[PDB]
């Protein structure tokens, strides 16, 4: 199902900024603004390990497929791999601009996708510490966000002019592309691309405050410069809410989106597009992140330095 009630907080002195569940949902890693990574035993809501990862705030985290490694990024352009069991730093990279996102290839944890600001995305290979700059469309200087699809067989990128590129992960061949445009046919920047843990659907969050949901299988069949039609367009027509972060439920049947203006989580049923629930946090606080548990109807959100948990309890 989906959560429906506030169900406590994860109390830490470190100020939470971003969080992510491991594959099984047994651990929640929380990156904090003192540069620490706090790893919670999520089944008992107790702290399992604290890693002193960076000097400056942690802004992105991703667990490896086997659960043994975490990759982190700092707001002053560092990307590091951590061995979770030892807490040791395996290796460290320095980029020229701040890091918007890091993500392991979901089926090859030797590979890390990095999205620096005002740059093409970059693929790191950890075994030899080499990097490859991915291709871009339109202009070389736009902000570009990117995500592996569920199997990591493709990389989807989206730029500040609404251009979506679909690249084969191994060869970087451009297999499909399209441009998101508004009703006014102006361009709208891609803010994030998020994939479901099951199936083939993904969503795009854009600056026009509409969450567009597509089936990746349809995207591939439309090819280059296609005009695929979204399966759903999710938005608040009354408040014109911009979205900070969006996530699929673990079975891909629901979508949660956190408002960038109020402390509110909107939950839609994915196939029908109906709004099922809005969860309201403490008034006045700003949401920074949201994560849906991979197995259960439990959502974690971050505001005012605290992880809030929402459950059907």
């Amino acid at each position: 199902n989906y959560p429906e009630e506030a169900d406590g907080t994860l109390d830490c002195i470190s100020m939470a900024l971003t969080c992510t569940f491991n594959r099984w949902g047994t651990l929640l890693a929380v990156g904090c603004n003192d540069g620490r990574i706090v790893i919670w035993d999520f089944l008992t809501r107790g702290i399992a390990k604290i890693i002193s990862a960076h000097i400056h705030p942690v802004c992105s985290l991703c667990w490896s497929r086997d659960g043994h490694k975490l990759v982190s990024a700092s707001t002053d352009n560092i990307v590091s791999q951590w061995d979770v069991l030892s807490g040791d730093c395996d290796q460290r990279f320095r980029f020229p601009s701040p890091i918007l996102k890091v993500q392991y290839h979901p089926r090859d944890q030797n590979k890390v996708l990095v999205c620096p600001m005002k740059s093409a995305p970059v693929m790191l290979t950890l075994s030899d510490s080499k990097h490859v700059v991915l291709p871009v469309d339109d202009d070389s200087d736009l902000n570009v966000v990117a995500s592996f699809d569920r199997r990591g067989e493709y990389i989807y990128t989206g730029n500040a002019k609404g251009k979506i590129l679909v690249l084969k992960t191994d060869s970087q061949d451009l297999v499909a592309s399209f441009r998101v445009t508004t009703g006014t046919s102006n361009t709208t920047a891609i803010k994030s691309i998020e994939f479901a843990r099951k199936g083939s659907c993904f969503l795009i969050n854009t600056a026009d405050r509409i969450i567009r949901v597509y089936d990746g299988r349809e995207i591939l069949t439309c090819g280059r410069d296609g005009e695929p039609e979204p399966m759903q367009k999710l938005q608040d027509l009354v408040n014109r809410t911009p979205w900070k972060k969006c996530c699929f439920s673990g079975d891909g049947e629901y979508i949660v989106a956190g408002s960038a203006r109020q402390h509110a989580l909107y939950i839609w049923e994915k196939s029908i597009g109906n709004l099922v629930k809005i969860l309201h946090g403490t008034r006045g606080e700003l949401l920074l992140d949201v994560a849906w548990h991979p197995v259960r109807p439990i959502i974690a959100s971050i505001s005012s330095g605290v992880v809030s948990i929402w459950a059907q309890n």
């Binding site: 594959r23 399992a48 020229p96 005002k118």
Partner: protein
């Protein structure tokens, strides 16, 4: 293979990217 589920309680590489500006600010922290 084998997986870490329960948690019972360095070499640096500089990546140089042509044309990427050096005065950007992370969106969490402000704007340039």
């Amino acid at each position: 293979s084998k997986a870490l589920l329960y948690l019972p309680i360095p070499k640096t590489t500089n990546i140089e990217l042509q044309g990427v500006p050096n005065d950007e600010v992370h969106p969490l922290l402000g704007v340039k």
